[PDB]
Amino acid sequence: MLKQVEIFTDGSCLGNPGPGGYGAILRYRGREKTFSAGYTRTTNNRMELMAAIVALEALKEHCEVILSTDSQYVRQGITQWIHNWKKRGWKTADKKPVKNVDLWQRLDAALGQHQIKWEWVKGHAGHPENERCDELARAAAMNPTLEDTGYQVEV
Amino acid sequence: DIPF
């Protein structure tokens, strides 16, 4: 069998764009590790992708992952867009590069490393780990130490 | 044994 890991992720951003951060919690058989980092100018959606990326890339071997996230953007990309993109060479119907392609590709690579079951939570309430990653993400956004170098500035 |  694969070892089963629970992952909880969240992103947070003070503007659109603005300072932001991600938070993530990995749990194996009741033992936890946390990840977070803050970026000077990013978007909420990029931070939500980053949280999942960092969490998945931290795994040292193939695992079964229960990945819990409140992110509608990540949900929408995983369920609706990723399949099309891999078929179209990561281009829109219009033949241009998809928004946040750097991170989606990186997430797709990390996803192919493991057996992933997604649990789409509807809020932070009653989800103490998801509430904790929000706190980690907000805390990171209030102390940003890195640049989101892949963010193509739109304003 | 912990995979992270």
Side-chain angles (χ1 to χ4, degrees):
Chain A
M1 302 289 291
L2 300 166
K3 296 180 188 170
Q4 189 184 96
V5 175
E6 284 174 315
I7 289 179
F8 308 89
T9 62
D10 197 32
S12 193
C13 190
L14 299 163
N16 181 233
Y22 67 75
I25 300 166
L26 275 56
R27 189 158 59 192
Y28 176 59
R29 296 184 55 69
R31 293 173 294 179
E32 286 187 356
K33 186 174 188 200
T34 63
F35 300 78
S36 71
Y39 297 81
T40 43
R41 191 162 62 169
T42 185
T43 70
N44 171 266
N45 287 346
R46 285 179 69 77
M47 288 299 92
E48 314 236 81
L49 287 174
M50 262 310 273
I53 288 161
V54 170
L56 290 163
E57 290 178 346
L59 298 175
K60 335 252 259 203
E61 59 180 87
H62 310 279
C63 295
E64 188 192 29
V65 178
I66 317 305
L67 207 168
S68 183
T69 177
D70 191 19
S71 177
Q72 311 98 316
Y73 180 72
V74 175
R75 182 169 186 177
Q76 191 172 356
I78 296 298
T79 59
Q80 309 174 11
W81 314 327
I82 188 71
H83 302 87
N84 283 163
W85 292 341
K86 293 180 73 62
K87 188 158 57 184
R88 294 203 203 97
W90 301 89
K91 298 291 185 299
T92 52
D94 219 352
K95 214 187 306 307
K96 294 176 183 182
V98 305
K99 184 147 133 287
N100 292 333
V101 59
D102 65 315
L103 297 181
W104 279 115
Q105 283 187 153
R106 195 163 151 192
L107 178 58
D108 182 55
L111 289 171
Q113 198 72 263
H114 311 280
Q115 193 73 346
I116 307 288
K117 190 186 175 220
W118 297 93
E119 84 139 2
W120 313 116
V121 295
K122 291 180 285 172
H124 303 295
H127 300 111
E129 293 83 1
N130 289 281
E131 184 184 34
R132 289 164 62 198
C133 44
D134 180 68
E135 296 172 2
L136 284 169
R138 293 167 175 278
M142 291 188 178
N143 192 17
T145 60
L146 296 165
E147 171 160 4
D148 182 348
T149 52
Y151 171 56
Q152 225 71 24
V153 183
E154 70 221 321
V155 302
Chain B
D1 191 60
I2 194 157
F4 50 80

